[PDB]
Short mmCIF file of N, CA and C and ligand atoms in Angstrom, two decimals:
data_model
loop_
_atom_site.label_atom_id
_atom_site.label_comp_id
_atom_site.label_asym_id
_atom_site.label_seq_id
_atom_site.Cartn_x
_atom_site.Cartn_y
_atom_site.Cartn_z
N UNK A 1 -63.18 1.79 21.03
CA UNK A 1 -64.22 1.18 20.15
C UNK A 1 -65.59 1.67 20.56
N UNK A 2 -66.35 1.88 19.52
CA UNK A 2 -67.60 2.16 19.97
C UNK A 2 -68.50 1.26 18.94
N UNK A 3 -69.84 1.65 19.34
CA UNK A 3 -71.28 0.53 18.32
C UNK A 3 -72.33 1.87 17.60
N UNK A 4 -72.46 2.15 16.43
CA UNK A 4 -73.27 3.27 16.20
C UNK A 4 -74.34 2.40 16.46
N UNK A 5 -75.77 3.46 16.82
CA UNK A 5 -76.68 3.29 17.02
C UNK A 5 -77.70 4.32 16.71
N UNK A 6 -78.88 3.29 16.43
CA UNK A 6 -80.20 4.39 16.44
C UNK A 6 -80.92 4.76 17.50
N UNK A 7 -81.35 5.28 17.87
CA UNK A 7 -82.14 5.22 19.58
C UNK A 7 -83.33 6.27 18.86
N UNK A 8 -84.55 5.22 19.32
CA UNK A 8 -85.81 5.71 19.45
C UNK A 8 -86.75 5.54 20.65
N UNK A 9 -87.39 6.56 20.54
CA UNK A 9 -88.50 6.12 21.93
C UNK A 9 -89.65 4.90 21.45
N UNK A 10 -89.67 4.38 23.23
CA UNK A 10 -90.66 2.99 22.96
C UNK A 10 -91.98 3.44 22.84
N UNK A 11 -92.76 4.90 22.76
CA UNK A 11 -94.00 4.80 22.50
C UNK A 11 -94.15 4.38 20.76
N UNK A 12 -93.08 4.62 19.80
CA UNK A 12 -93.14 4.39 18.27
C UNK A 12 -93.08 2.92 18.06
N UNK A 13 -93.56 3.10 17.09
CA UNK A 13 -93.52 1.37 16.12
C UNK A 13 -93.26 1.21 14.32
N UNK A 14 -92.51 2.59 14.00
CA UNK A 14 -92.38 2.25 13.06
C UNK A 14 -90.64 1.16 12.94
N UNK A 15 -90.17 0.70 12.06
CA UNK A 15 -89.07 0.02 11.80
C UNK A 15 -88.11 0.83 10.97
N UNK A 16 -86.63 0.29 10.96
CA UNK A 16 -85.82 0.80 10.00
C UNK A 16 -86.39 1.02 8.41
N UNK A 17 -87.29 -0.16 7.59
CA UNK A 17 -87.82 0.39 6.54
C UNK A 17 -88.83 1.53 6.20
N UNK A 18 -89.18 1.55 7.54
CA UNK A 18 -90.00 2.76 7.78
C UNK A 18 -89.58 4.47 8.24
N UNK A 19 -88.30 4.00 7.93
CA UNK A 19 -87.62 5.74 7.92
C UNK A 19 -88.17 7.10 7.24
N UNK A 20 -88.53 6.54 6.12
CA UNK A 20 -88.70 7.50 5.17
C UNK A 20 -89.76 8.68 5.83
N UNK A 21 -89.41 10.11 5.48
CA UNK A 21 -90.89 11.26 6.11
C UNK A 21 -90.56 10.90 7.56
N UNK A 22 -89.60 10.55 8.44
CA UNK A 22 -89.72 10.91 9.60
C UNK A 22 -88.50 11.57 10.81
N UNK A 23 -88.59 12.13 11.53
CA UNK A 23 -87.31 13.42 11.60
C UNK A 23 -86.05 12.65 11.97
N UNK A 24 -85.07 13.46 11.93
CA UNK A 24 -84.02 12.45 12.36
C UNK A 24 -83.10 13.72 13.32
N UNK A 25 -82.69 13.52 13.65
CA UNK A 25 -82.01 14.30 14.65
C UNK A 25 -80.14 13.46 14.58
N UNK A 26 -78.84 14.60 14.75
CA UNK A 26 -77.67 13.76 13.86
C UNK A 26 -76.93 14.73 14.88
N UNK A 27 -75.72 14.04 14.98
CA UNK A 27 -74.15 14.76 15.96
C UNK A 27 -74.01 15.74 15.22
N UNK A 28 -73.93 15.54 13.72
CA UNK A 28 -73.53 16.63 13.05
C UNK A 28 -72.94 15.91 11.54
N UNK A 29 -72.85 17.15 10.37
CA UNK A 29 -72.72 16.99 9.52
C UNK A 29 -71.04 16.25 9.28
N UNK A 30 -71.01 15.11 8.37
CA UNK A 30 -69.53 14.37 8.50
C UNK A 30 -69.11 13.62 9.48
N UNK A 31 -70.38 13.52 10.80
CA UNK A 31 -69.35 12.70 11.68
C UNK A 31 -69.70 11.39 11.78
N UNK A 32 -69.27 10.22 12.56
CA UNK A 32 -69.60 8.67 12.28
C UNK A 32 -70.72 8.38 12.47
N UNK A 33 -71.11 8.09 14.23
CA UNK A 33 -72.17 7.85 13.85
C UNK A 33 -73.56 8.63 13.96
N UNK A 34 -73.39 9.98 13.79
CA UNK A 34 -74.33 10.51 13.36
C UNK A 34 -74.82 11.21 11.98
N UNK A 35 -73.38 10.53 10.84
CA UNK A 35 -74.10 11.19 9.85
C UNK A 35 -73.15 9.79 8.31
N UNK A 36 -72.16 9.81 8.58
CA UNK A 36 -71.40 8.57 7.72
C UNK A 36 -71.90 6.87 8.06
N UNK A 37 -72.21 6.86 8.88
CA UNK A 37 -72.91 5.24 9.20
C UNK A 37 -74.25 5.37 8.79
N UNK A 38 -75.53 6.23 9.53
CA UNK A 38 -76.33 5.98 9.16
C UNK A 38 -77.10 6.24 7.65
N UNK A 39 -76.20 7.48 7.20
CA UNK A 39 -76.58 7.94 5.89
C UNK A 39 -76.29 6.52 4.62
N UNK A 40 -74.96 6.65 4.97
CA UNK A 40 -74.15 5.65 3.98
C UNK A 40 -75.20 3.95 4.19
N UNK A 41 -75.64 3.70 5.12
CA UNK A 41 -76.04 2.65 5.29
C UNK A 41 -77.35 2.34 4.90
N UNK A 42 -78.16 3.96 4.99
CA UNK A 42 -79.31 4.45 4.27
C UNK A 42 -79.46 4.01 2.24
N UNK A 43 -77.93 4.42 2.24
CA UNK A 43 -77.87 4.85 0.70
C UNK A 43 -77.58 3.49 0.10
N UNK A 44 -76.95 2.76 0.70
CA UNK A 44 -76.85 1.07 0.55
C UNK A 44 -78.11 -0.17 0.45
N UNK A 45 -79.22 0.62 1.62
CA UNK A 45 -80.26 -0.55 1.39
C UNK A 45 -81.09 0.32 -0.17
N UNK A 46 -81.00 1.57 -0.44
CA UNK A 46 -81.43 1.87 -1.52
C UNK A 46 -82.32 2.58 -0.94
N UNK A 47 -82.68 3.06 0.48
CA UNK A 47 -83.54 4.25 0.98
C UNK A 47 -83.35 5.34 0.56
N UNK A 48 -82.06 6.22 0.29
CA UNK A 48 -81.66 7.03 0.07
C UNK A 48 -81.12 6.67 -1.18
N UNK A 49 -82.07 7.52 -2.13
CA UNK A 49 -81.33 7.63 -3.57
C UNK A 49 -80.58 8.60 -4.05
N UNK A 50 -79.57 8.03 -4.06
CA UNK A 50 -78.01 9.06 -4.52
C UNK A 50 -77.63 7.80 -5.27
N UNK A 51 -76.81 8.21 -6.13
CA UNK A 51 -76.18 7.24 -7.62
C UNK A 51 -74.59 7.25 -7.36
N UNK A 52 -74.40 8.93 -7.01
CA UNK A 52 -73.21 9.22 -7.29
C UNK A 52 -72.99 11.16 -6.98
N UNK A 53 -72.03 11.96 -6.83
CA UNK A 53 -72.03 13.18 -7.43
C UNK A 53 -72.48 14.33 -7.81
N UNK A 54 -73.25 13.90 -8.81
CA UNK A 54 -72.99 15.27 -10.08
C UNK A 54 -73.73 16.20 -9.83
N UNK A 55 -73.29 17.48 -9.40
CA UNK A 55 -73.70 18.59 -8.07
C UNK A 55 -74.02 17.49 -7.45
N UNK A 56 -74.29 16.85 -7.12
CA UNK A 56 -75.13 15.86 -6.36
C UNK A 56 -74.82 16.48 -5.17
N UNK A 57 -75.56 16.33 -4.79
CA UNK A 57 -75.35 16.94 -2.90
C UNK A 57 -76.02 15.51 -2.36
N UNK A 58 -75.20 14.76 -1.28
CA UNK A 58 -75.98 14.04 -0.23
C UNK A 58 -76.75 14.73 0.95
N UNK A 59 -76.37 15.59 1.47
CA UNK A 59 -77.50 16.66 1.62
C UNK A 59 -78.64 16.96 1.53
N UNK A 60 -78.74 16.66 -0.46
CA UNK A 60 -80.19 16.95 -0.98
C UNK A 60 -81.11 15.77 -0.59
N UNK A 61 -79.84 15.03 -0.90
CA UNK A 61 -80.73 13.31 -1.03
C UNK A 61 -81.39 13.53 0.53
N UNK A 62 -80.60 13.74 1.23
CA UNK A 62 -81.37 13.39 2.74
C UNK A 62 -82.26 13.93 3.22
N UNK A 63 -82.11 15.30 2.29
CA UNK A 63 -83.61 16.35 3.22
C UNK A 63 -84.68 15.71 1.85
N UNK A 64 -84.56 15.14 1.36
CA UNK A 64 -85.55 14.33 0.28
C UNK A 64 -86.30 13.55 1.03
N UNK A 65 -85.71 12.42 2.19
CA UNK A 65 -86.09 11.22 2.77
C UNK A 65 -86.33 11.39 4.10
N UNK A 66 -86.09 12.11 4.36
CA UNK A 66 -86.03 12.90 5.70
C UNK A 66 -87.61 14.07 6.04
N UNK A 67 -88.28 13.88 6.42
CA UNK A 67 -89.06 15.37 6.39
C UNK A 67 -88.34 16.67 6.97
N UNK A 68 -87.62 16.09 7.81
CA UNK A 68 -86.63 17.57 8.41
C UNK A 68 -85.91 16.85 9.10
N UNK A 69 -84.98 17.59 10.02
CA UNK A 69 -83.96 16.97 11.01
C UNK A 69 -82.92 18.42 11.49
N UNK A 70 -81.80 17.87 12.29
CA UNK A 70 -81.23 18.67 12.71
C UNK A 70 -79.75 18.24 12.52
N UNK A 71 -79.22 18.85 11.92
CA UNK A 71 -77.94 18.59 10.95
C UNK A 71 -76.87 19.65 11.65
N UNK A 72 -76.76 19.69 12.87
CA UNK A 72 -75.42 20.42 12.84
C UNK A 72 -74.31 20.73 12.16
N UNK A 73 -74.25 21.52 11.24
CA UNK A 73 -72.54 22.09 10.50
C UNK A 73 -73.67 21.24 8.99
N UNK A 74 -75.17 22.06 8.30
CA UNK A 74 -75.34 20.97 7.27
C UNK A 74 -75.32 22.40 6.19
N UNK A 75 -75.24 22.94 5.12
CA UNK A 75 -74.52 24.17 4.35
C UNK A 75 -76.00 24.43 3.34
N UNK A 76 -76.21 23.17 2.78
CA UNK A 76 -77.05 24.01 1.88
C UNK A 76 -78.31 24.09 1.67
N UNK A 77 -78.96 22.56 3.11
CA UNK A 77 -80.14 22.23 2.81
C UNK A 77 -81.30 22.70 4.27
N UNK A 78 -81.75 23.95 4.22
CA UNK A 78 -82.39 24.10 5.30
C UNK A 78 -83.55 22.94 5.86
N UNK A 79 -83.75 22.51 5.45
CA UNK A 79 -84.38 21.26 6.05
C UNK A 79 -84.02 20.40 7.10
N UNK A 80 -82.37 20.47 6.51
CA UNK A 80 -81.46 19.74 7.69
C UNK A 80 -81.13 20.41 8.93
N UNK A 81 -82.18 21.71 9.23
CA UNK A 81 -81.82 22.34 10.01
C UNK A 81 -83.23 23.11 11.00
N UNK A 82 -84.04 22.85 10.11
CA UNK A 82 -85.62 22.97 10.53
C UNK A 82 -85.77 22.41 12.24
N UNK A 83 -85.59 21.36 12.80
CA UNK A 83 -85.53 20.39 14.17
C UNK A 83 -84.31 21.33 14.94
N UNK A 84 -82.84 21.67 14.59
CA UNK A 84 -82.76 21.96 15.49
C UNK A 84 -82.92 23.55 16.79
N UNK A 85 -82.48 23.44 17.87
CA UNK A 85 -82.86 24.12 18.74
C UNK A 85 -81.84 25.62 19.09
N UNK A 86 -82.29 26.08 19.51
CA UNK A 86 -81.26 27.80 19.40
C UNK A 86 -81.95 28.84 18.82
N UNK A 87 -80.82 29.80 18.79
CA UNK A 87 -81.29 30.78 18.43
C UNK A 87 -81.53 31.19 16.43
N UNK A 88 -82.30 31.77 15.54
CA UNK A 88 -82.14 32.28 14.46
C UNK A 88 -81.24 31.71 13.89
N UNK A 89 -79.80 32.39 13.88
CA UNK A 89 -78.25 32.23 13.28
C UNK A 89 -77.34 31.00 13.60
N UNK A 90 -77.50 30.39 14.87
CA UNK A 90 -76.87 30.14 15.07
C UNK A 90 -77.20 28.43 15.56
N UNK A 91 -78.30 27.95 15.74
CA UNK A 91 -78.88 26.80 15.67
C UNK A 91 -78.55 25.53 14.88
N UNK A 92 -77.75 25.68 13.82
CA UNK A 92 -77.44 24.58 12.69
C UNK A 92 -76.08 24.96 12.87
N UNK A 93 -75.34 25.76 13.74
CA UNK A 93 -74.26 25.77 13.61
C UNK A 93 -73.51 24.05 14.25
N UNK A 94 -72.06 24.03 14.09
CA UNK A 94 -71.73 22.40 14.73
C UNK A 94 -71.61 22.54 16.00
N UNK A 95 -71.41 23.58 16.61
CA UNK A 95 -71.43 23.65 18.18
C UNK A 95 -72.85 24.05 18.75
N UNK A 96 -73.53 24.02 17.95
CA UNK A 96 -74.82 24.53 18.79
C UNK A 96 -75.75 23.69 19.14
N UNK A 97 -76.72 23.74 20.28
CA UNK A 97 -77.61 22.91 21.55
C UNK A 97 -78.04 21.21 20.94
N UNK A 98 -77.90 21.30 19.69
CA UNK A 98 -78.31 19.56 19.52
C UNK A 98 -77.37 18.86 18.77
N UNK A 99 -76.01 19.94 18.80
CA UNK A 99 -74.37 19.13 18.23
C UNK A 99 -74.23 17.91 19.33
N UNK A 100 -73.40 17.37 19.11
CA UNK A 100 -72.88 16.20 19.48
C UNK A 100 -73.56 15.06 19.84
N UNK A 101 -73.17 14.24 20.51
CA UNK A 101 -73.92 12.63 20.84
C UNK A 101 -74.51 13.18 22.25
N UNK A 102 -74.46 14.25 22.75
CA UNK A 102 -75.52 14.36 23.69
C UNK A 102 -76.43 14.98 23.12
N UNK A 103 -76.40 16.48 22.09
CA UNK A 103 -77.38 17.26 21.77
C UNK A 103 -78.17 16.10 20.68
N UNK A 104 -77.88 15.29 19.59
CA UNK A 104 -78.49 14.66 18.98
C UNK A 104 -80.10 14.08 19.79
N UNK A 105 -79.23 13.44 21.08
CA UNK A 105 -79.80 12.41 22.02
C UNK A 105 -81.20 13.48 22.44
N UNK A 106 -80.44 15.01 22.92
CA UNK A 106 -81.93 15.81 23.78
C UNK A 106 -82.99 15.97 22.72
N UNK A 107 -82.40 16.47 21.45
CA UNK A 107 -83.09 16.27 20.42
C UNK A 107 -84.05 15.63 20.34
N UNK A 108 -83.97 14.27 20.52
CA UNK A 108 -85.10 12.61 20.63
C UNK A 108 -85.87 13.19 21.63
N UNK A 109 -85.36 13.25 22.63
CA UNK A 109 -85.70 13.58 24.37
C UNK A 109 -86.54 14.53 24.05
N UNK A 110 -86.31 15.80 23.71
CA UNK A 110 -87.37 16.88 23.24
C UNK A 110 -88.23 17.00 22.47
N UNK A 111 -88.55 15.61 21.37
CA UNK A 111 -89.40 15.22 20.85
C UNK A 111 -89.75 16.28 19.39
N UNK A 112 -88.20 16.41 19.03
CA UNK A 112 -87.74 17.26 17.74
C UNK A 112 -87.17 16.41 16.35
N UNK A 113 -87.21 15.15 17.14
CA UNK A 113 -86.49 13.89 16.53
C UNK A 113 -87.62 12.83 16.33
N UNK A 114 -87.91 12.20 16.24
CA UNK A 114 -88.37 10.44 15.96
C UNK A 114 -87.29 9.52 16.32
N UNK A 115 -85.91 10.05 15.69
CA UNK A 115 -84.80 9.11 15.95
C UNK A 115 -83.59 9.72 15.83
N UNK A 116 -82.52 9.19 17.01
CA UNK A 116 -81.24 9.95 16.76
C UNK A 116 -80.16 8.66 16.89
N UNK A 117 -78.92 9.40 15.93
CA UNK A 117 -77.64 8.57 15.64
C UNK A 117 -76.99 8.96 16.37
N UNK A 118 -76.46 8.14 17.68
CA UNK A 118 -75.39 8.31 18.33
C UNK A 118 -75.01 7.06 18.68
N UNK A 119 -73.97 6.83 19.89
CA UNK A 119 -73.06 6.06 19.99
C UNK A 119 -73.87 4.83 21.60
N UNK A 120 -73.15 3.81 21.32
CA UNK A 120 -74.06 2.48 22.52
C UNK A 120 -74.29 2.84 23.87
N UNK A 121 -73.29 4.47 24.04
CA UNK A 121 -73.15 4.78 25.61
C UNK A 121 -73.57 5.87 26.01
N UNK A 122 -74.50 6.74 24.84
CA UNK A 122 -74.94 7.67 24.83
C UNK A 122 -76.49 7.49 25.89
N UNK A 123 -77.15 6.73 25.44
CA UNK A 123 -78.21 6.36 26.60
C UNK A 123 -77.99 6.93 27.91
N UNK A 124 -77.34 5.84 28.12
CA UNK A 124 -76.98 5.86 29.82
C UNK A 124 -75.98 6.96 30.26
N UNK A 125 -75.57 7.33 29.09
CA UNK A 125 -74.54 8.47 29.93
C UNK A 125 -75.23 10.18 30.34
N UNK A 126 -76.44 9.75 29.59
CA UNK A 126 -77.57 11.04 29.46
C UNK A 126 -78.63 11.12 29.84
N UNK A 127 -79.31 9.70 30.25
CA UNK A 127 -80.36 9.69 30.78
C UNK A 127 -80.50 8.20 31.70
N UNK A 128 -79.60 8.57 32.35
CA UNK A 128 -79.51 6.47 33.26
C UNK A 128 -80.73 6.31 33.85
N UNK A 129 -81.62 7.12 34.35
CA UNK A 129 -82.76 7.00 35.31
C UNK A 129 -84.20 6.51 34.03
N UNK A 130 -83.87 6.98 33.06
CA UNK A 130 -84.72 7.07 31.91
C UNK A 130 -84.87 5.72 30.80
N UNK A 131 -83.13 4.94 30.65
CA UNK A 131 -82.97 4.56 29.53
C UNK A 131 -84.48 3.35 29.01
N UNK A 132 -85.14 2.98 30.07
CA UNK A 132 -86.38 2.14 30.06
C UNK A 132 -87.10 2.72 28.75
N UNK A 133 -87.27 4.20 28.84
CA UNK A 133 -88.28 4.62 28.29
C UNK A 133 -87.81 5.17 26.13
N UNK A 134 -86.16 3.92 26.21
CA UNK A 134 -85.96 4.62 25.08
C UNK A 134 -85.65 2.50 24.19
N UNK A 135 -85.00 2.76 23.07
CA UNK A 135 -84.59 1.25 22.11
C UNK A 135 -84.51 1.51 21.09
N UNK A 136 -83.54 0.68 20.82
CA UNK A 136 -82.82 1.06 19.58
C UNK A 136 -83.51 0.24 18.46
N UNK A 137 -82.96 0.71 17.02
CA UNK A 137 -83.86 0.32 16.09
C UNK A 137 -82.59 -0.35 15.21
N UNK A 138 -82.95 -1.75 14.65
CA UNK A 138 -81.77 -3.03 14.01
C UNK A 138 -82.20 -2.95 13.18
N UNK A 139 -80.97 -3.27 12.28
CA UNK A 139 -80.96 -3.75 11.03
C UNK A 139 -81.59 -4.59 10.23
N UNK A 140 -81.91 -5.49 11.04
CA UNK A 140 -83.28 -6.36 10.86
C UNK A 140 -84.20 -6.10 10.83
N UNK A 141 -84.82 -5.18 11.24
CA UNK A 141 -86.16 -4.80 10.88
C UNK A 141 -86.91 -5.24 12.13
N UNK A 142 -85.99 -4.49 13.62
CA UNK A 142 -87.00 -4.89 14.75
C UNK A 142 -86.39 -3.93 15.68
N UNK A 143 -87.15 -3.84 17.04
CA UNK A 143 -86.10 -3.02 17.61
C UNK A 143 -85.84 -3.75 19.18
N UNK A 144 -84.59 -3.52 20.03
CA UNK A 144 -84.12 -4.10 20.87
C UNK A 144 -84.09 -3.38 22.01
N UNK A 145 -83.74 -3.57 23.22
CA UNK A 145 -83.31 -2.38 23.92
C UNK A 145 -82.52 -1.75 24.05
N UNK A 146 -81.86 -1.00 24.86
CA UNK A 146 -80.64 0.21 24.53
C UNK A 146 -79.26 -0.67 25.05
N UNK A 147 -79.85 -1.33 26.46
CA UNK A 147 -78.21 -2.16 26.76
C UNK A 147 -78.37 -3.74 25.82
N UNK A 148 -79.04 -3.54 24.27
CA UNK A 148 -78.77 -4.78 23.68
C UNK A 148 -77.89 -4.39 22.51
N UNK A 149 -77.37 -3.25 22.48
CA UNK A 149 -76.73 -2.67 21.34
C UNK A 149 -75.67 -3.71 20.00
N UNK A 150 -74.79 -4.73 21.00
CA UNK A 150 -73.79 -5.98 20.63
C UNK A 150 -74.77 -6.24 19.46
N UNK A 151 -76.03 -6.53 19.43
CA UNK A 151 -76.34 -7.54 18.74
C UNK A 151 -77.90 -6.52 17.57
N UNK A 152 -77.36 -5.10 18.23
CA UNK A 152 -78.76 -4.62 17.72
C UNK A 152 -77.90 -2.92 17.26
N UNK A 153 -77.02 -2.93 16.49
CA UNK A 153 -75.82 -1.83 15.93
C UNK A 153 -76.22 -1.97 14.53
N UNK A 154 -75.42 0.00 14.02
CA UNK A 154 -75.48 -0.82 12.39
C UNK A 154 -74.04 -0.58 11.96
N UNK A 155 -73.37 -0.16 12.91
CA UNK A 155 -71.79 -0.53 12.59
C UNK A 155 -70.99 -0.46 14.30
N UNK A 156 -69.52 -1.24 13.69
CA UNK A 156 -68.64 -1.04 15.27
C UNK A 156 -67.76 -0.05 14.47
N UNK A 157 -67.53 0.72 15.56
CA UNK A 157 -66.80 1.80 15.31
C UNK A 157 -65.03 1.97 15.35
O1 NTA B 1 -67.41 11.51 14.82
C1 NTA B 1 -66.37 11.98 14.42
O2 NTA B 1 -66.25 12.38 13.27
C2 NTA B 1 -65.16 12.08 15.29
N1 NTA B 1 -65.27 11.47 16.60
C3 NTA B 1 -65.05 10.06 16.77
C4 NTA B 1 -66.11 9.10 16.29
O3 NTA B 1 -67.33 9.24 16.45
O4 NTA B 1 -65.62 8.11 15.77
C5 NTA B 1 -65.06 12.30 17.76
C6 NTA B 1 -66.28 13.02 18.27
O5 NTA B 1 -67.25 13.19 17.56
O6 NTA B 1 -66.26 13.43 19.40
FE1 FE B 2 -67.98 10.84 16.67
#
């Protein structure tokens, strides 16, 4: 079992309604919680406008709401690929330097992000000496700290 999460640094103050225009940094394209929890959960409060389909790319919708980000494995929307780190070719690939729930995380850390989707144990498993200087952002419209995840998630996994 895991808790998706948002993790932002504590010098910010914007809130979850305040997503919109600011970078996001993601595990990668299709995966839980860096791209199906927070997107889908996006597209639910009505942040992200997608209807449905038709060409529809969710993709588009996101580099819409998004000013940029880093989308490991994202195909058609360079935007989703602007944040991350590497070389030319090979930077937006799904294995490359800001894939997974750690690269998402350096992402934040490197200050390429505003906010990244990874998992309740990603914190501490990447930066234990640090996690002070990071908190996650709730559903509610506040943010908590990183070991308050139980009560400050936007899905269990
Ligand atoms: O995210 C995915 O799509 C697949 N996961 C599990 C998960 O996050 O539930 C394995 C992984 O990413 O290592
Ligand atoms: Fe995963």
């Amino acid at each position: 079992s895991y808790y998706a999460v948002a993790v932002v640094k504590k010098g910010t103050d914007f809130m979850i309604k305040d997503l919109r225009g600011k970078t996001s940094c993601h595990t990668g394209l299709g995966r839980s919680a860096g791209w199906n929890i927070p997107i889908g959960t996006l597209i639910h409060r009505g942040d992200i406008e997608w209807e449905g389909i038709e060409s529809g790319s969710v993709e588009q919708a996101v580099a819409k709401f998004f000013s940029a980000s880093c989308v490991p494995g994202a195909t058609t929307e360079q935007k989703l690929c602007r944040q991350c780190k590497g070389d030319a070719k090979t930077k937006c690939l799904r294995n490359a330097p800001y894939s997974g729930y750690s690269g998402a995380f350096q992402c934040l850390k490197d200050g390429k992000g505003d906010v990244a989707f990874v998992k309740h144990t990603t914190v501490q498993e990447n930066a234990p000496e640090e996690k002070d200087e990071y908190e996650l952002l709730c559903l509610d419209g506040t943010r908590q700290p990183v070991d308050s995840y139980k009560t400050c998630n936007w899905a269990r996994v």
